Write a protein that binds this ligand. Structure first.
Ligand SMILES: Nc1ncnc2c1ncn2[C@@H]1O[C@H](COP(=O)(O)OP(=O)(O)NP(=O)(O)O)[C@@H](O)[C@H]1O
Ligand SMILES: [Ca+2]
Ligand SMILES: [Mn+2]
Ligand SMILES: [Mn+2]
Length: 463
């Protein structure tokens, strides 16, 4: 009954290779996203490995692997592509929008570059948990519809079970798609991609279209990174092929949500220069946008490209600043705000304070009371009490009740984030065949702004 179309295949010829997934050995479905399946209109019967393991095609699907290129760790890498993933099809929804179904781990393709074409259970689980977590934090992201595991050995640092993730997203367009055809000296294919993107995702733009479009591409990336900074998400691999044109979080690998507040956090152990450290994300995404701008210069006026690039800073800082004010419960903008936040961040960094728990406990603040669960979390309690006294004194300038402010703060400061230790515990149980933890953790991550009475709100063990 579902409606699939071959929009990419037919409108962007010679940008992909058509092929089928390669099923794994004894593949089994271990989790699917019931809520997302409902919003997509997927009959519950389709989950009873089937399409989720690349073993069945639905009417209208026409699987293909896309080509693209990227700058990796700041240097041009040339062609990369869908080396282990396949766009099974584009699902048309009743409101006219369209959603990609991309099977990650689907098998060898022309872009596999001597790799095995496979994904592993631990990484499919992590990507499913982080992407769904990001969605319910309200941050744009690819979504996770299903995981299958299998009996197929896949060789990494150790042998792993081969697994597939069904990833859903409005598009998998990457900055690297544009770079691919620019460096392959195919400027009309770069322009075809741009016009495809505008037709399907910026359709309201009448035919100044490129200036307005690229200004909005910049805005959406600036907004994305501002959101990552506010929640403490470190991506770890901001290569240009992992930058979504639409401003979605894309390609969860060696990511991390902060536990202790560490501005220079390096989540990716292969990032030996810290290029993708947490505090570098805003500079890196501007550099990525600058590389994307270069590809558009054959048909977008340079003044327009630079007007868009110039706006990145203010879009990012306005989003970040307004969001941090919400997190602090600053219900009017005041001059001392920036200094109070710098003081708090300095306190947290020097105390190695937990990021999420600090803001969640701060949401319990009673402006006329010096008591707080935060006091016990600081070794230097006097320094904390001093900041907290000045913070509450400033809160009083808003003239807002504790009830109203706590409601706001609890609506924007999550009680829980997808910490590495939580994902790892889910992985260990799934690997032994027990999916209860994976399901329970997914359920909790759908409700990040509610308090909990279990250990999903707990810091990782010190040892
Ligand atoms: N095991 C693998 N076999 C084949 N190609 C791979 C494999 N792992 C990574 N690649 C390719 O190497 C390039 C860089 O990897 P990466 O940025 O980690 O993408 P990815 O996780 O495979 N997929 P995506 O989430 O779609 O970006 C991309 O072209 C990948 O498709
Ligand atoms: Ca610590
Ligand atoms: Mn990638
Ligand atoms: Mn990856």
């Amino acid at each position: 009954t579902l409606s699939f179309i071959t929009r990419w295949r037919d409108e962007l010829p010679a940008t992909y290779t058509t092929l089928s997934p390669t099923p794994l050995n004894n593949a089994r479905l271990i989790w699917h996203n019931a809520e997302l399946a409902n919003t997509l209109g997927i009959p519950s019967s389709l989950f009873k490995a089937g399409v989720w393991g690349g073993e069945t095609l639905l009417p209208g699907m026409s699987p293909l692997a896309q080509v693209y290129s990227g700058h990796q760790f700041g240097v041009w890498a040339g062609q990369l592509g869908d080396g282990r993933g396949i766009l099974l099809g584009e699902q048309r929804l009743a409101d006219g929008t369209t959603m990609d179904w991309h099977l990650k781990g689907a098998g060898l393709t022309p872009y596999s570059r001597m790799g095995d074409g496979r994904a592993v259970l631990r990484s499919t689980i992590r990507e499913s948990l982080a992407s769904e977590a990001m969605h319910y934090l309200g941050i744009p992201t690819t979504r996770a519809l299903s995981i299958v595991t299998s009996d197929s050995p896949v060789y990494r640092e150790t042998v792993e079970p081969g697994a597939m993730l069904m990833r859903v997203a409005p598009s998998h367009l990457r900055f690297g798609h544009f770079e691919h055809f620019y460096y392959r000296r195919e400027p009309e294919k770069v322009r075809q991609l741009a016009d495809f993107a505008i037709r399907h995702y910026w359709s309201h733009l009448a035919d100044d279209k490129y200036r307005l479009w690229f200004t909005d591409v910049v805005a959406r990336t600036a907004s994305l990174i501002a959101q990552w900074q506010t929640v403490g998400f470190a991506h770890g691999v901001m290569n240009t092929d992992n930058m979504s044109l639409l401003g979605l979080t894309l390609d969860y690998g060696p990511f991390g949500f902060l536990d202790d507040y560490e501005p220079g956090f390096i989540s990716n152990h292969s990032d030996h220069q810290g290029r993708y450290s947490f505090d570098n994300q805003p500079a890196v995404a501007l550099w990525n946008l600058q590389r994307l701008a270069q590809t558009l210069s054959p048909f977008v006026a340079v003044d327009a490209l630079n007007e868009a690039l110039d706006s990145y800073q203010q879009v990012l800082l306005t989003h970040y600043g307004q969001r941090m004010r919400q997190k602090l419960g600053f219900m009017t903008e005041q001059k001392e705000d920036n200094a109070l936040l710098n003081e708090l961040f300095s306190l947290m960094a020097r105390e190695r304070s937990d990021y999420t728990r600090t803001f969640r406990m701060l949401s319990l603040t009673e402006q006329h009371s010096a008591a707080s669960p935060l006091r016990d979390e600081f070794i230097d309690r006097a320094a904390f009490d001093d900041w907290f006294a000045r913070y509450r004194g400033r809160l009083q300038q808003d003239e807002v009740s504790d009830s109203e402010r706590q409601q706001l703060m609890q609506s924007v400061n999550p009680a829980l984030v997808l910490r590495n230790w939580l994902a790892q515990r889910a992985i260990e149980a799934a690997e032994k065949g027990d999916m209860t933890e994976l399901h329970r953790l997914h359920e909790a991550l759908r409700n990040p702004f509610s308090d909990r009475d279990d250990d999903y709100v707990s810091r990782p063990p010190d040892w």
